[PDB]
């Protein structure tokens, strides 16, 4: 399989994911630790095997990441090491067109009434908006291949819908909260409980201040991931799923749930 897809095609990011899953051991949804050197070694193998040199990004991926033992990557760093789909990647570059959080403000923009996760026809419309912004057109082999892998690799209940952490695995893991938040996971159950606790006004809604309270709670719960030097930063973050400074709990149900709702 690796032998094949690595040295073949214009790997879309579903098949990319297959190759990735071929060494995404932990299933972190991020190429974790030593499995990167495991990747990297199969990559450089596929390379020297099929007689393809390990191109300076892939070769540097071994030279700079072949020792990223305590490392972790999203689809982002590998998507241009394994040359996935460079033009399709432009929308993937929209997850990194500024930040890992402000694009999330974009992601809920299309959805219906902001359900917190885009549905099928709605994510099948998500790309259309993106198509109007990539300054290209994002061709059929970009739009569908890409819309589909988002909608699949992180379909949270196999409903044909889209929640964050695929687009957020395709998000730049820099100032994101999206990987810390996969391990931070309360549980969708205490998630529901805590949200009711964050709803201390009894409004049935939460605004970005109680969001920092969401995090004062969380940090003091999972300080190995959520740290007080960025806690009002995580407030900055989740704030971007919610609507108008005022968080409806529909869109802040995937950050801290677990990767579900």
Swiss-Prot record:
Alphabetical UniProt keywords: Acetylation, Calcium, Metal-binding, Repeat, Vitamin D
Gene3D superfamilies found in the cross-reference section: EF-hand (1.10.238.10)
Residues involved in Ca(2+) 3 binding: 155, 157, 159, 161, 166
PANTHER family in alphabetical order: CALBINDIN
Binding site for Ca(2+) 1: 24, 26, 28, 30, 35
Domain EF-hand, first and last residues per copy: 11-46, 53-88, 98-133, 142-177, 186-221
GO terms assigned for molecular function: calcium ion binding; calcium ion binding involved in regulation of postsynaptic cytosolic calcium ion concentration; calcium ion binding involved in regulation of presynaptic cytosolic calcium ion concentration; vitamin D binding; zinc ion binding
Binding residue positions for Ca(2+) 4: 199, 201, 203, 205, 210
InterPro entries named in the record: Calbindin_Ca-bind, Calbindin_six-EFh_dom, EF-hand-dom_pair, EF_Hand_1_Ca_BS, EF_hand_dom
Organism in which the protein naturally occurs: Rattus norvegicus (Rat)
GO biological process: cochlea development; learning or memory; locomotory behavior; long-term memory; metanephric collecting duct development; metanephric connecting tubule development; metanephric distal convoluted tubule development; metanephric part of ureteric bud development
Residues that coordinate or bind Ca(2+) 2: 111, 113, 115, 122
Purpose: Buffers cytosolic calcium. May stimulate a membrane Ca(2+)-ATPase and a 3',5'-cyclic nucleotide phosphodiesterase.
Chain spans, region Interaction with RANBP9: 2-7
Domain notes for this protein: This protein has four functional calcium-binding sites; potential sites II and VI have lost affinity for calcium.
Record's protein name: Calbindin
Subunit note: Interacts with RANBP9.
GO cellular component: axon; calyx of Held; cuticular plate; cytoplasm; cytosol; dendrite; GABA-ergic synapse; glutamatergic synapse
Stated family: Belongs to the calbindin family.
Name of the coding gene: Calb1
N-acetylalanine, modified sites: 2
């Amino acid at each position: 399989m690796a032998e094949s897809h690595l040295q073949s095609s214009l790997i879309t990011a579903s098949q990319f994911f297959e190759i990735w899953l071929h060494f995404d051991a932990d299933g972190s949804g991020y190429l974790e630790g030593k499995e990167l050197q495991n990747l990297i070694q199969e990559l450089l193998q596929a390379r020297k095997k099929a007689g393809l040199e390990l191109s300076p990004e892939m070769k540097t991926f071994v030279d700079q990441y072949g020792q990223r033992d305590d490392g972790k990557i999203g689809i982002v760093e590998l998507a241009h090491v394994l040359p996935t789909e460079e033009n399709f990647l432009l929308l993937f570059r929209c997850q990194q067109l500024k930040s890992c959080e402000e694009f999330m403000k974009t992601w809920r923009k299309y959805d219906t009434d902001h359900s917190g996760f885009i549905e099928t026809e709605e994510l099948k419309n998500f790309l259309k908006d993106l198509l109007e912004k990539a300054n290209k057109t994002v061709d059929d082999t970009k739009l569908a291949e890409y819309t589909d892998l988002m909608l699949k690799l992180f379909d949270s209940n196999n409903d044909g819908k889209l929640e964050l952490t695929e687009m957020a695995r395709l998000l730049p893991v820099q100032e994101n909260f999206l990987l810390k938040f996969q391990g931070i996971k309360m549980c969708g159950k205490e998630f529901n409980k805590a949200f009711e606790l964050y709803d201390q006004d009894g409004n049935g809604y939460i605004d970005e201040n109680e969001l920092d309270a969401l995090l004062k709670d969380l940090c003091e719960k999972n300080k190995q991931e959520l740290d007080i030097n960025n806690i009002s930063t995580y407030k900055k973050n989740i704030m971007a799923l919610s609507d108008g400074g005022k968080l409806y709990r529909t869109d802040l149900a995937l950050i801290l749930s677990a990767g579900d709702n």
